[model samples]
Target: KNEDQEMCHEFQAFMKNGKLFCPQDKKPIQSLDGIMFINKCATCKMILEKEAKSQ
Candidate 1:
């Protein structure tokens, strides 16, 4: 939000009707406990977790 590239780059925050959505399936994701960026999408979450563990 502070910069133009911030919302469209690596941290792509897809929004519709004033709500955030998952980039993988166009499904609505939740920002757990008021968290703004990470841990929102289920599929994305698992994928990230998997990659992290592999490293």
Candidate 2:
């Protein structure tokens, strides 16, 4: 049920210089993306892993 906990976000994925940037904010989050965010947040760190795939 934790995965269903919504915080209200917006994401825009775009390519710049052959790298993917996923912005998780209303404004452009230019420096970091998916893996970086997971490292920063405890909740996001919970779901984005191989062990959770089959659950």
Candidate 3:
């Protein structure tokens, strides 16, 4: 089934203070070990992996 697509459904990321944020909720993401990135923002996470693979 197709779903509604709008600005609310968009995935966006923010970089500030050397930390990543979730645009959907504006929440700060924490790393797995204070240095490595794990499961944080699903949207950004997938976005990151996809970008990494392409590069």
Candidate 4:
């Protein structure tokens, strides 16, 4: 159930300007091509962001 938790999160993150954000902290998440986050209330200002694979 890796994705079962879906990045191990409770509140479903958001997508904006090609990014994700968890209101858990009122901080906005950003992305370029690829990456997802394991968000939380006590999350980092800039969480882990991976590069997205393109074709």
Candidate 5:
């Protein structure tokens, strides 16, 4: 959001194969709880899970 290259925290969906994918890794997003999920790149969604669960 603050810069052009690393605005993934401000996420945008990528279209692929009639579905949505991660902008960074191009991985398809998962269907889960809004309270259970966070707006993050799939690459770091698991990477930073240990950091904080509040987001």
Candidate 6:
């Protein structure tokens, strides 16, 4: 988040909105990558676990 790189942690956080949604600013992949987003962990383990169970 402090730099320009799209970290898995910060990028993963944006996945909360939807499986396809990302932070927009720190997108790990390019706009055309077309990858289905998975949950991102960053101190919020419970929600991630729920998402994992749901998946």
Query: Candidates 1 and 6: which is better by lDDT?
Result: 1
Stretches > 4 Å off in candidate 6: 1-6, 17-20, 26-55
Per-residue alpha-carbon lDDT of model 5 for 1-55, expressed as tens digits? 2332232333443423322354443554442333212344443344334234565
Global lDDT of model 5: 0.37
Judged by lDDT, which candidate is best?
1
lDDT of 6 by residue, 1-29 (tens): 32223434454565555442444344443
In candidate 5, residue 26 scores what lDDT?
52
TM-score of 1: 0.27
Q: Per-residue alpha-carbon lDDT of model 1 for 1-55, expressed as tens digits? A: 1342333333234544333464553543344435444444433344334434766
Winning candidate number (TM-score):
3
C-alpha lDDT values of all predictions:
0.41, 0.31, 0.37, 0.35, 0.37, 0.40
lDDT score, candidate 5, position 51:
30
**Model 2 RMSD to the real structure?**
8.7
Model 2 pairs whose backbones collide: none
Task: Count clashing pairs, candidate 6.
Answer: 0
* lDDT comparison, 1 vs 4, better candidate: 1
Evaluated against the true structure, the overall lDDT of model 1 is: 0.41
Count residue pairs with overlapping backbones in model 1.
0
Lowest lDDT 10-residue stretch of candidate 4: 46-55
Q: For every model in order, what is the number of clashing pairs?
A: 0, 0, 0, 1, 0, 0
Q: Which scores higher on lDDT, 2 or 4?
A: 4
lDDT of 2 by residue, 1-55 (tens): 4322221121112323323343444443222334434322333333233234676
Weakest ten-residue segment in model 5 by summed lDDT: 1-10
Models 1 onward score TM values of 0.27, 0.22, 0.29, 0.26, 0.20, 0.26
